[PDB]
Design a protein around this ligand. Structure first.
Ligand SMILES: [Cl-]
Ligand SMILES: [Cl-]
Ligand SMILES: [Cl-]
Ligand code: NA
Lengths: 249, 250, 250, 251
């Protein structure tokens, strides 16, 4: 199943889409400058591009840590991003009440990994009718993903992306099971599967090897965070994706 | 470090405390009935007991499964449980705004595993001044519990219980690392550590083996998401009494 | 199923048997000293005891590392240990040809964990008719032990002990699944199950005590352990727990 | 570091080498037939090829299951393969005494994973001077491969291949850590790394093989286990990705 995001076709047998941008929104001008760069690079490489950021640092590690710009100022920055660039955007939500007004602005809304089993947030996300990105928790198997998709379907929204970020492997370590992408396609009705290579690594030659290996299994998209390093990175990812997508299934 | 919960002393060198009750509150009548059974068994054996229930069923497996009575009517039920049995109670909270009103009635407030890194919730829980049960995520290592404890301490609350639930072990399976109890005591100032045996089991023989193994390491309490109860508790009490009666090694 | 090893009765509902000694035999005199210590402590505590050592260093870390005294001198030392102390002994074998000569002298022969699926070694060990200790590989699940047991039975030997040594847990780490003991008992005919606490690991001997107590709480036939009187202090506590567990009806 | 195996160059920056054949040697005519098919297909696509089989199946799922033709007859069969097709061959050794007899006939000798820490066997394999494939145990981390490599070096043999076969992942189940390849390259001096996709496990073998080879590897290790007739379709896709990845500079 493909999904249309404005102009963009996202699917497991389509050219890969890049989801990319900043950990946490800090200021308008800082964001425009990051986004500008991703757009120029993707535009000449001809890679469809969706801008990502959080407006809220929900898991900030110290009670004195930066909070983010908050919802109100974050949606303003997102509104500026879409008007200046004409691209879709994606952000995460952590509370049912945030869902409707986030979804008014942001093309894709994201269910945070920690919160995948929070049923009221699932329902409030489903209700908006928007494309939803479901971040697979490190503690859930690719087979348990259908249970979450079932909830979204029962609540009447089938426009779902599944997003891989690694699996718990002993203490304090992650491994990405390259067979899990296939399992998710097979049990979840060939919904778009994308690969969050950045969070898979947190526990760069390493990021390139991992991104290539995951994209070799034929995926809808790549999901990251951030002289000319991105561009050279994406040239290599595009070369692989083009080849893979050109072979019959 | 011991924690006083009304007339109960909770600590890794005190007689173990049983936490248990019902999954989700629906009615007063139904709650009082379950709680009465726990009370009668634990009283007969002399085991301290804290009644546990959710007012919001936040991770129900179907979206349309009953969501619980909700905050307002839930707290009314908890009030009547406390009045009728004279025991402490515990419930989980989900948003910052819930913490104060819940803490007015519930002696222990519980931080759900999936919220354990939500800084706003941790702060609002800390500010109640109540005893807090921290449920350990199955993907978090025992040494990472320190970081959560730290956040609570920064926000002014040291009355913390750590609740073991098992660890991710390949796909689907959980294993309980019996060494992780000691790592938590050692790294987290010997806060009371309790063992949620049920979650780890996703059969009576299995629950018994696992509960006995954990209690053998010397723990403040046993946490169920559960004369069947009585027979099980007779065995746990036997082990706990033996272990606790002996001094920690020289 | 219980096993007689000379005068010792090994079984999951019998008093636990301690297995211990040294890693690699170095000389007759230091062997006899180490054994005397274990014998002194276990006799005074009333615990049956089987001495263990390797005559071999098959996995020695450097090609220049110490080899051990080897089979011929190894077997001589085991003869002397047995004549001096009148206790059974246990050693590992890594090659099929080693099995019959080693079994001449050693009461129990041990299938190293790395080799537990090596069909020729299984067969050669089985043919000796001796008591065999099967080390569960860290990479095998408890439900797979039935397959190795089945092979030993096809090769004609049912005097089998199963030995837990932990399971792979990410890179460079082991966890012991306390539910595995019960799975082995249930699927392998209640053969004696023993717990290699020493290999399951890797303040600190705090750790070995915690692990040993947690494992013995599940009701096991025996324990593998290595040594002012730490061994004594550990065993007093393990024996108290074992006596309680074994006095409860299953 | 590259290794020459007769006229084949094996290396992490060279066209991938296929190590393929069967599990256990069973009979002469069947072996030759299966080898013929591998040879035909790899020759057709220009893929360097090394025939693999065991003469001693040491971990059979039942004790009286056929162990294989044994050393003497197994080496005769390998001789016939090399004579008929003119390709290199690879087999596993199980005891020190086997190492010399096997190495005089076989181009690559393999250290089974379950024996990987047996020092006596490592020493005797090292002393042949033969190219050695080291099979990484599923319970061993990538950074611990350097300890095995060091024992081989100490005994005088540096012609070593590292073979990935997956890592234990909970019970009864394997995951391949795609970052494990780079760790082995970095810590073991960029010795050739190959990927045993068969023992790491359909559509799956292909996904897994393509992911592995995307990280830039010296070879692919499989048993036909694949259906033998779909071999060409499988290899066309591997070769396409390998040719892409190898054609770009590193970094
Ligand atoms: Cl996660
Ligand atoms: Cl092992
Ligand atoms: Cl292995
Ligand atoms: Na208060």
């Amino acid at each position: 199943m493909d999904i249309k995001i404005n102009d963009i076709t996202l699917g497991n047998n389509s050219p890969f889409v890049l989801f990319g941008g900043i950990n946490v929104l800090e200021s308008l001008d800082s964001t425009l400058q990051t986004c500008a760069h991703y757009v120029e690079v993707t535009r000449k490489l001809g890679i469809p591009y969706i801008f990502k950021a959080s407006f809220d640092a929900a898991n900030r590690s110290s009670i004195h840590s930066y909070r983010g710009v908050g919802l109100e100022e974050g949606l303003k920055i997102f509104e500026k991003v879409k008007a200046e660039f004409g691209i879709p955007v994606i952000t995460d939500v952590h509370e049912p009440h945030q869902c409707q007004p986030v979804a008014e602005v942001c093309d894709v809304i994201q269910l945070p990994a920690f919160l995948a089993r929070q049923t009221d947030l699932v329902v409030a996300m489903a209700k908006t009718g928007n494309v939803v990105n479901i971040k697979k928790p490190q503690f859930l198997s690719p087979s348990q993903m259908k249970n979450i998709v079932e909830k979204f379907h029962e609540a009447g929204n089938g426009k779902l992306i599944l997003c891989e970020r690694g699996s718990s492997f002993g203490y304090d370590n992650l491994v990405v099971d390259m067979l899990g992408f296939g399992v998710m396609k097979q049990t979840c009705g060939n919904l778009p599967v994308i690969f969050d290579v950045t969070h898979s690594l947190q526990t760069r030659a390493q990021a390139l090897d991992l991104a290539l290996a995951g994209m070799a299994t034929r995926l809808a998209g790549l999901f990251l965070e951030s002289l000319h390093l991105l561009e050279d990175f994406l040239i290599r990812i595009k070369a692989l994706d083009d080849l893979i997508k050109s072979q019959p299934i």
